[PDB]
Design an enzyme around this catalytic site. Structure first.
Site, short mmCIF file in Angstrom:
data_model
loop_
_atom_site.label_atom_id
_atom_site.label_comp_id
_atom_site.label_asym_id
_atom_site.label_seq_id
_atom_site.Cartn_x
_atom_site.Cartn_y
_atom_site.Cartn_z
N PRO A 1 0.82 -1.21 0.00
CG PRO A 1 0.08 -0.94 2.19
CD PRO A 1 0.75 -1.93 1.28
CG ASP A 2 1.16 5.77 -2.00
OD1 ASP A 2 1.32 6.39 -0.93
OD2 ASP A 2 1.03 6.35 -3.09
CG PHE A 3 -0.48 4.60 4.04
CD1 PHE A 3 0.55 3.66 3.93
CD2 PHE A 3 -1.67 4.23 4.66
CE1 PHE A 3 0.43 2.40 4.51
CE2 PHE A 3 -1.80 2.98 5.25
CZ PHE A 3 -0.75 2.06 5.18
NE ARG A 4 -5.29 6.23 -3.40
CZ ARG A 4 -6.05 5.64 -4.32
NH1 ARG A 4 -5.66 5.58 -5.59
NH2 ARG A 4 -7.22 5.08 -3.98
CG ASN B 1 9.51 2.80 -1.18
OD1 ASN B 1 8.90 3.85 -1.12
ND2 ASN B 1 9.67 2.12 -2.33
CG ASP C 1 9.15 -1.69 -0.11
OD1 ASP C 1 10.18 -2.08 -0.68
OD2 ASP C 1 8.56 -0.64 -0.44
CG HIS D 1 10.70 8.47 5.00
ND1 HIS D 1 11.58 9.52 4.89
CD2 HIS D 1 9.50 8.94 4.61
CE1 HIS D 1 10.94 10.59 4.45
NE2 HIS D 1 9.68 10.27 4.28
#
Ligand SMILES: [Zn+2]
Lengths: 11, 263
Positions: free
Chosen positions: B34-37, B98, B100, B117
């Site tokens: 998932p990308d957080f939009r 990322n 991941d 991050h």
């Protein structure tokens, strides 16, 4: 390149 | 005004030989992350990486932690384009937001990586700041328990940079890396988050900056430089277009099949 804490970019 | 072909020609002439890459969630959605939009129960997307919501309800963040703890998701073609860029001796450094870990899994050496991050290889108590190594909390997380500090009872958190926390010291490699770069690649990121986004500004003014993203927005849209280049669309397809214009579609296919065979 800026510094600071992780934050939202000002539009 | 430069083309995407122009850029690939620079690489093939080796006129661009110390390439630095800023990437985001764009490049990992083709893999399932998932990308957080956008399923996760948050009052808004960003609360998953905010400290107040995390203390109120760490459960969504640890849900995402459990999803990402490795071996679930595989790298896709964008990762392997970065790995090949390395293998060809062109990658000065790869800056990622990322968490991941597929940049490592694709075979890029930690040496060449800045996980800007944060990472799950370490954790810190949210209150007393005692460090713990990663695996020491992993099992807790994989069993839907919240891990706590054996000193102060604080929830201990993986070393993911939330909103309000400082970035890891390894990030300060940018002070050295960006002024050496002869090409900036921005891959799959709307550059919504500081100070990461500000790095686009820290390459020398004659340095081409190629965006391969869905949108052309933010810094690069506002204050653009003559030798900027944008390949708007689906990131994977844009990369695969660059790869073909480079000559590498063939050895790309080979590398992807070899690696996905290993795993
Ligand atoms: Zn503690």
């Amino acid at each position: 390149g800026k510094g600071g804490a992780k934050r939202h970019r000002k539009v | 005004k430069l083309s995407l072909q122009d850029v690939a020609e620079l690489i093939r002439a080796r006129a661009c030989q110390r390439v630095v890459v800023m990437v985001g969630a764009g490049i990992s959605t083709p893999s399932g992350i998932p990308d957080f939009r956008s399923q996760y129960d948050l009052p808004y997307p960003e609360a998953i990486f905010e400290l107040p919501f995390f203390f109120h309800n760490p459960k969504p963040f640890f849900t995402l932690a459990k999803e990402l703890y490795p071996g679930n998701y595989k790298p896709n073609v964008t990762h392997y384009f970065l790995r090949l860029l390395h293998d060809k001796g062109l990658l000065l450094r790869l800056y990622t937001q990322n968490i991941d870990g597929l940049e490592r899994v694709s075979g890029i050496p930690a040496s060449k990586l800045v996980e800007a991050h944060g990472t799950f290889a370490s954790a810190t108590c949210t209150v007393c700041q005692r460090p713990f190594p990663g695996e020491d909390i992993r099992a807790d997380v994989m069993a839907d328990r919240v891990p706590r500090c054996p000193v102060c009872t604080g929830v201990v958190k993986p070393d993911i940079v939330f909103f309000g926390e400082p970035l890891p010291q390894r990030f300060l490699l940018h002070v050295v890396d960006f002024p050496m770069a002869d090409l900036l690649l921005i891959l799959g990121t709307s550059l919504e988050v500081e100070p990461f986004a500000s790095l686009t500004e820290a390459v020398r003014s004659s340095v081409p900056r190629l965006l391969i993203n869905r949108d052309l927005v933010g810094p690069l849209a506002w204050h653009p430089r003559s030798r900027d280049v944008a390949q708007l669309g689906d990131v994977v397809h844009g990369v695969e277009s660059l790869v073909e214009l480079l000559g590498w579609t063939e050895e790309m296919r080979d590398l992807v099949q070899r690696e996905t065979g290993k795993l």
